[PDB]
């Protein structure tokens, strides 16, 4: 059947779906079963959507609402054609905190750290992930969301990843690396991508990058994925970490070359990342531009550490103050307008390097802080920095 709430109508739900209003704009609907029943047997009172480049700018948030007598929670809302990004949902029996129908800018940054810690993703909709906001999240597409290079038409790959632990001794921990290559033989480039765990097994980047070479808008290459461990290691080795960049050259890089050729010309090296895993791409480059010739950086956080708009990163200022040099890099640098207080943080680079500023593809694209949007940039920023390779 399809009575609204019935177990053969909640199979019918595979997450949000959405209706055209005109050229610009859709109307989607959310919903969410609630594990507890009706409102009767339930002891959630409020469930909020976050949509990560959304629910964020707007000023005071509204709940889901509860089809009496149903385990049914809807909502709705509008999104531009092209719109992509994740939302995820936050159940919760607490309904305090956004109690006062204003708010505040202060008030909200609040209210929604409060509540995050207990976001789900959607668990109707299959794509789903841990987020960049480190709070996990699900996909969604508006039909005329921008071509992302590759992810349209996906091919299996003809050899698989080999997943290996490599077992730093300087970092002194262990981590999962995977190798995957995309051609047999002949001088392939190295491209090292950061949050490997996430581009292996998140979104496993596999048959995209496949497919973009299959088309040769990619030169058979070697990747090498490294497992962030988890965030408080992610947060220390990321960023302008030294050990972290001597560990993989020293360690790490003559491991693969054994296992997997790869060109020794910096020119044509990738290292790729994005927030964290972006500014970590950079500061490699800047301090290793003899093994490091190209940085793709989505979304870099290059406040870092000083969140927010108190004081310029200290990459910024390390650069400010003449000290390490650009020196010889070519590099994609990206982030989108709606994330936005990254995007004041990469203007500010940008400017910072006035010297490069001739080898240096700079994007502002309509994404959020946002694995949804990142994907396409990264698979866009490996064709650009290879463009060379087809002289």
Request: hydrophobic share 40%; with cysteine.
């Amino acid at each position: 059947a399809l009575k609204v709430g019935s177990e053969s109508w909640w199979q019918s739900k595979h997450g949000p779906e959405w209706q055209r209003l005109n050229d610009e704009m859709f109307e989607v609907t959310f919903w969410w079963r609630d594990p507890q029943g009706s409102e009767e047997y339930s002891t959630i009172k409020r469930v909020w959507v976050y949509i990560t480049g959304v629910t964020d700018h707007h000023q005071q948030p509204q709940s889901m609402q509860r089809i009496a007598g149903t385990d049914v929670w809807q909502w709705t809302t509008q999104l531009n054609a092209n719109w992509r990004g994740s939302y995820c949902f936050i159940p919760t029996e607490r309904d305090d905190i956004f109690s006062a129908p204003s708010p505040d800018r202060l008030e909200l940054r609040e209210g929604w750290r409060k509540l995050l810690p207990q976001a789900i993703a959607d668990p109707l909709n299959p794509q789903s992930w841990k987020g960049g906001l480190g709070h996990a999240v699900s996909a969604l597409e508006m039909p005329q969301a921008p071509l992302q290079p590759g992810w349209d038409c996906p091919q299996a790959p003809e050899i698989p990843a080999k997943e290996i632990i490599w077992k730093s001794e300087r970092l002194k921990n262990s981590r999962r690396v995977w190798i995957f290559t995309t051609g047999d033989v002949t001088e392939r480039p190295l491209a090292v991508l950061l949050d490997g765990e996430f581009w292996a097994q998140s979104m496993p980047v596999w048959p995209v990058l496949t497919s973009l070479t299959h088309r040769q808008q990619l030169p058979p290459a070697v990747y090498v994925l490294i497992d962030a461990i988890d965030t408080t290691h992610r947060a220390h080795e990321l960023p302008c970490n030294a050990d972290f960049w001597l560990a993989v050259q020293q360690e790490l890089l003559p491991l693969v070359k054994v296992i997997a050729p790869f060109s020794d010309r910096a020119d044509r090296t990738v290292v790729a990342g994005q927030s964290f895993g972006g500014l970590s791409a950079l500061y490699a480059g800047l301090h290793w531009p003899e093994r490091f010739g190209c940085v793709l950086s989505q979304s870099g956080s290059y406040w870092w550490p000083h969140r927010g708009g108190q004081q310029e990163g200290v990459l910024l200022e390390k650069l400010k103050a003449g000290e390490v040099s650009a020196e010889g890099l070519r590099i994609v640098l990206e982030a989108g307008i709606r994330e936005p207080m990254i995007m004041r943080a990469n203007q500010a680079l940008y400017a910072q390097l006035h010297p490069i500023k001739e080898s240096i593809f700079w994007r502002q694209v309509d994404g959020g802080h946002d694995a949804l949007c990142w994907r396409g940039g990264l698979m866009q920023g490996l064709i650009d920095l290879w463009q060379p390779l087809f002289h």
